[PDB]
């Protein structure tokens, strides 16, 4: 009963360690990227690239696309928008079959391309040769290059480049040429004329190759030169737009800085050029007519134009941060090593990117010819900015993860990558993104197959001061009936398994299965606690009322192979009893729970000589309920701990341990403490796999917390655990309260004579065959040796003695009465009639007599008797108890201590009763003194006896 209030007392943090199993081609991606050592990998990629360019141009050289006429109508005529999108998809198809109809296409991606298709069209040959038998390295490369030959409306495909990008440009030039055929701009250099041939729809078929695009752009530049010349008439003529290239477009730290410095220099000059003013004042003079903005809407309703050009500010920040590139070329060992440089370069390219992103905000078929030509000239300067180099996951010994909208992107040897958690088929997986794919899960495509993952959405609202008088006057989950302790929730999103695969194949995602002995299709037995804590994160019963919070951070550690195993392990910090208010005065909270209850029992745990630990449970009046041992096994300290925890539940009990105050056996004891206090911080009993009723007492979501957070700052109490002096716990007859308090030494005869003159009598009991030594301890010491100091001590029984052996071990069994005879007989003392022989003993003059009398008395007083080999460790008293018997542990029936170690544990438990008397007898809240004096124990031992 008393402990059932001690749930949800304080929050606790754990880090959970689990192994990781690589899934799919993740381990290959990792191993492959451990290239180093330079190697021709990039050289062979370049060779594969140029045959891609060749095959592409050759498949499209003398090509002619049928639907081209259909589409060109829709666009040039007088919804047309959807018919164009449709006929564009038809065209994207028509490009792809022409690409797939080329010879050698079915050897794209297949290893079979290594042979003739590369050894024939050398430095290059040795580079190719070097990747025979190593073809899998281009797996990721192939998955990326696959998108060239796709009819899907994606920006990376050959069909999209030609049909969705270039073809509308080509047609828009056809629309512009009306003004150039008019006004007689017969272009300079177009000798003998017939430039009109460029703006017949059919001429586009000749621009499906890079070499036809070059030719088209070159001549159209000549026209634009004459167009720009036509500005002199003082209305204005739209310039022609250039077509983008066929899709053909980081060796060291020395080379890259010149590229950065160079492009930045070209760019800011281009951004200070007339290109920008021409775009702005064309965009202003368009009055917004036929200008469309991001899936789109037209500016014809307005105000906004001049709110838009004032992103001039993107030019100002490019300029500033280009100047800030003085940290690169003025102030600069490798570049990636530099705190500022890496940041200044990223700040620079980012600022460019936002300019491009801002530009791309514009763009339908009827769009304004002049505005969009100026926009295109300016944008051609920026579309070079796909710089997209790196400075790398599993290069390092660890990767740090974040599960949240919070990743820093720099400490440059410890930057956060995204972690995602994915559930499928009752298993748990960990995905960790390559930084270039961090946004793959921001808006994932809607799931369509049956084979899906459930991705964990990590919803956290930190520090609510995020966002109308001052401080004295809804897409989030916030639940209906400051929010800090409700501002966390996990929710789920179905994601199609093929999308996850695509990222792995592309080397953009590193997916692992989270594994422990309990996460297997072959798993058996109860759950390990850390498996349980982990499961409870995702268990809906916790999401409904949070006990377990996932701290957003996590770390992965990688030991690479060296035909040993590639080992990955995961550490996940978590908080348990998240959002509870920490109980201030926990020890009193327990002391007041005990104060209320009569029925409390005690568990005493002691260090033993033959048992490392001995546990003894006793009731409130002193009776032994259970006395159980180490070596009694029917990771060892974990078992005792798990046992002792059950006993606290089973017996409604507190725990009493030795106070290691003034003082190897005592090292495991301190380990046991630590483990025992650790355990009782947060105790969970129900370790079942099915986990049916975890909200009950001691279930996962209602753990008990019976002890205070371990810190070394500890006094004599830690919750239900109390510490008591070890004084005379093992060397005391529990049935009498008797202990050997004689401070003895055979110093000399004078001081031996009136040591033995302190006894009331020394006599023989012929009937019981023992010698009796009667005395009062007061006659021997000034100490307060309990409330009974009168005793009669008898040469009762056998004793085990270590003894002086010329051969240096031995031990023997002695019967003190018969030796006490042999000595008295040797020295002619008349004992047999039962007189008091005291006056006759102290009359002996020889010291040898007293040496041997001391030894016999000492041996009589030797209550604990042991064997070097554990064969025996028992306690025998030399005093008769309430049962007219001499206490002997070997004759125990379980109602008394079985051995000396048990006696220690028993008498430690008894002192707990004394503290229970202290706790109950004090007031609510007052400090409780637990310093038990040696005199109090002897008093308690001699009165609460048996």
H/E stretch holding 176 reads: helix 167-181
Q: What is the largest CA-CA distance in the chain?
A: 157
Domains in the chain with CATH codes: 7-26+419-463+482-576 (no CATH), 35-233 (no CATH), 253-382 (no CATH), 586-726 (3.30.420), 749-902 (no CATH)
| Structure tokens, 677 | 């206090």
The one-character DSSP state at 112 is G
CB burial readout 548-574, b (16+ within 10 A) else e: bbbbbbbbbebeeeeeeebebebebeb
Distance of CA 436 to the CA centre of its chain: 23
Distance of CA 401 to the CA centre of its chain: 9
Cα atoms in the 13 Å half-sphere on the side-chain side of 380: 13
Structure determination technique employed: X-ray
| Structure tokens, 22 | 């690589």
Degrees to nearest 5, angle at CA 839 with 835 and 842: 130
d(CA 762, CA 766): 13
Cα atoms in the 13 Å half-sphere on the side-chain side of 608: 28
| Structure tokens, 853 | 């009398």
Helices marked H in 191-325 — which ranges? 210-229, 253-271, 274-285, 305-309, 313-323
Resolution in A: 3.1
H/E stretch holding 901 reads: helix 900-921
d(CA 385, CA 253): 18
Residue 692 CB partners (closer than 8 Å, separation 6+): none
Helices marked H in 61-149 — which ranges? 68-76, 80-100, 116-119, 123-129, 139-145
Packing angle of the helix pair 847-861, 816-826 (nearest 10 deg): 170
User: How many other CB atoms are there within 10 angstroms of residue 272's CB atom?
Assistant: 12
Q: Which of 935, 887, 945 is nearest to 913 (CA)?
A: 945
Q: Do residues 657 and 721 touch, judged by C-beta distance below 8 A?
A: yes
Q: Is 442 exposed, middle or buried (0-12, 13-18, 19+ CB in 10 A)?
A: exposed
d(CA 521, CA 427): 9
Q: Where on the phi/psi map is residue 579: left (φ > 0), alpha (ψ -120 to 50), or beta?
A: left
| Structure tokens, 352 | 């460019």
d(CA 699, CA 693): 7
Q: Which of 125, 160, 127 is nearest to 43 (CA)?
A: 127
Cα atoms in the 13 Å half-sphere on the side-chain side of 492: 12
CB burial readout 200-234, b (16+ within 10 A) else e: ebeebbbbbbbebbeebbebbeebbebbeeeeeee
Answer positive or negative: Cα dihedral of 44, 46, 47, 53: positive
Q: What are phi and psi of 802, to 5 degrees?
A: -70, 135
H/E stretch holding 737 reads: none
User: How many other CB atoms are there within 10 angstroms of residue 903's CB atom?
Assistant: 31
The one-character DSSP state at 931 is -
Packing angle of the helix pair 253-271, 339-359 (nearest 10 deg): 40
Q: Is 860 exposed, middle or buried (0-12, 13-18, 19+ CB in 10 A)?
A: buried
DSSP three-state, residue 747:
coil
d(CA 695, CA 705): 15
């Amino acid at each position: 009963m008393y402990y059932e209030s001690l749930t949800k007392q304080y929050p606790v943090s754990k880090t959970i360690r689990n192994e990781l199993i690589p899934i799919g081609k993740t381990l290959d991606n990792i191993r492959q990227n451990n290239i180093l050592r330079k190697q021709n990998y990039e050289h062979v990629k370049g060779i594969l690239d140029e045959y891609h360019k060749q095959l592409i141009n050759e498949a499209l050289d003398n090509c002619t696309l049928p639907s081209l006429k259909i589409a060109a109508e829709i666009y040039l005529k007088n919804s047309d928008r959807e018919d164009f999108n449709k006929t564009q998809d038809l065209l994207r198809k028509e490009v792809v079959e022409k690409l797939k109809a080329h010879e050698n296409f079915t050897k794209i991606g297949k290893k079979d391309i290594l042979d003739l298709l590369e050894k024939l069209p050398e430095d290059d040959y040795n580079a190719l040769e070097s990747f025979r038998n190593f073809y899998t390295y281009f797996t990721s490369y192939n998955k990326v290059r696959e998108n060239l030959y796709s009819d899907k409306e994606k920006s990376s495909t050959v069909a999209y480049r030609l049909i969705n990008e270039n073809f509308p440009k080509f047609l828009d030039n056809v629309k512009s040429y009306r003004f150039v055929k008019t006004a007689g701009i017969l272009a300079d250099g177009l000798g003998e004329e017939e430039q009109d041939s460029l703006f017949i729809v059919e001429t586009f078929n000749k621009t499906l190759t890079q070499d036809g695009i070059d030719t088209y752009n070159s001549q159209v530049g000549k026209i634009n030169s004459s167009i720009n010349l036509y500005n002199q008439k003082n209305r204005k003529i739209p310039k022609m737009k250039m077509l983008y290239k066929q899709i053909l477009s980081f060796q060291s730290d020395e080379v890259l800085i010149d590229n950065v410095e160079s492009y930045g220099s070209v760019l800011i000059e281009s951004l200070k050029s007339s290109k920008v003013s021409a775009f702005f004042d064309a965009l202003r003079e368009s009055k917004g007519k036929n200008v469309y903005v991001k899936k789109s809407y037209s500016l014809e309703h307005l105000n906004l134009i001049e709110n838009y050009i004032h992103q001039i500010s993107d030019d100002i920040e490019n300029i500033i941060i280009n100047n800030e590139t003085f940290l690169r070329i003025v102030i600069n060992r490798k570049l990636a090593k530099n705190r500022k440089a890496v940041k200044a370069i990223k700040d620079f390219l980012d600022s460019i990117k936002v300019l491009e992103r801002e530009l791309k905000l514009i763009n339908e078929l009827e769009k304004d010819l002049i505005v969009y030509s100026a926009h295109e000239e300016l944008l051609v300067e920026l579309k070079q900015v796909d710089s997209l180099y790196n400075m790398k996951p599993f290069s390092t010994e660890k990767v740090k993860l974040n599960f949240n909208r919070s990743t820093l992107l720099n400490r440059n040897k410890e930057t956060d990558n995204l972690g995602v958690l994915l559930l499928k088929d009752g298993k748990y997986y960990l995905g960790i993104m390559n930084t270039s794919a961090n946004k793959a899960f921001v808006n994932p495509p809607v799931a369509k197959t049956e084979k899906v993952f459930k991705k964990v959405d990590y919803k956290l609202l930190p520090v609510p001061n995020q966002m109308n008088p001052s401080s004295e006057i809804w897409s989030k989950f916030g639940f209906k009936f400051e929010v800090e302790k409700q501002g966390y929730k996990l929710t789920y999103t179905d994601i199609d398994e093929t999308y996850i695969n695509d990222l792995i194949e592309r080397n953009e995602l590193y997916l692992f299965q989270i594994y422990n002995k309990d996460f297997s299709m072959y798993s058996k037995g109860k759950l390990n606690l850390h498996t349980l804590y982990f499961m409870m994160l995702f268990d809906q019963r916790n999401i409904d009322d949070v006990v377990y919070k996932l701290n957003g951070e996590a770390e992965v550690f990688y030991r690479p192979a060296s035909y040993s195993k590639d080992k990955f392990t995961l550490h996940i910090p978590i908080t348990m009893n998240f959002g509870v208010d920490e109980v201030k005065r926990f020890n009193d909270a327990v002391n007041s729970a005990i104060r209320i209850d009569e029925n409390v029992n005690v568990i005493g745990i002691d260090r033993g000589e033959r048992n490392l630990l001995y546990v003894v449970v006793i009731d409130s009046k002193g009776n032994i309920l259970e006395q159980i041992s180490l070596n009694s096994i029917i990771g060892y300290l974990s078992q005792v701990v798990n046992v002792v925890a059950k006993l606290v539940l089973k017996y409604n009990a507190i725990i009493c341990l030795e106070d290691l105050n003034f003082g190897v056996e005592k090292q495991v004891y301190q380990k046991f403490e630590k483990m025992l206090i650790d355990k009782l911080n947060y105790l969970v009993i129900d370790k079942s796999r099915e986990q049916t009723s975890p909200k009950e007492l001691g279930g996962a979501l209602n753990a008990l917390q019976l002890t205070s957070k371990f810190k070394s700052e500890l006094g004599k109490q830690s919750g239900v655990i109390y510490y008591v002096p070890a004084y005379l716990t093992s060397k005391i007859d529990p049935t009498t309260g008797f202990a050997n308090l004689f401070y003895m030494k055979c110093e000399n005869v004078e001081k031996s004579k009136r040591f033995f003159d302190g006894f009331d009598f020394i006599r023989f009991n012929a009937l019981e065959n023992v010698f009796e030594f009667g005395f009062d301890y007061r006659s021997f010491t000034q100490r307060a040796c309990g409330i009974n100091s009168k005793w009669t001590v008898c040469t009762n029984g056998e004793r085990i003695i270590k003894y002086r052996n010329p051969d240096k071990n031995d031990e023997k069994v002695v019967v003190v009465t018969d030796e006490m005879k042999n000595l008295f007989e040797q020295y002619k003392i008349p004992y047999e009639d039962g007189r008091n022989v005291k006056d006759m003993i102290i009359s002996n003059e020889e010291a040898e007599f007293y040496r041997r009398l001391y030894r016999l008395l000492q041996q009589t007083l030797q209550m604990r008797n042991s064997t070097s080999d554990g064969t025996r460790d028992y306690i025998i008293s030399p005093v008769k108890n309430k049962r007219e018997a001499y206490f002997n542990s070997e004759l125990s029936d379980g109602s008394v201590p079985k051995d000396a170690d048990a006696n220690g544990a028993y008498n430690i438990a008894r002192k707990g009763l004394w503290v229970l008397e202290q706790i109950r007898q004090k007031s609510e809240g007052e400090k409780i003194n637990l310093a038990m004096t040696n005199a109090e124990w002897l008093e308690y031992a001699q009165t609460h006896l048996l």
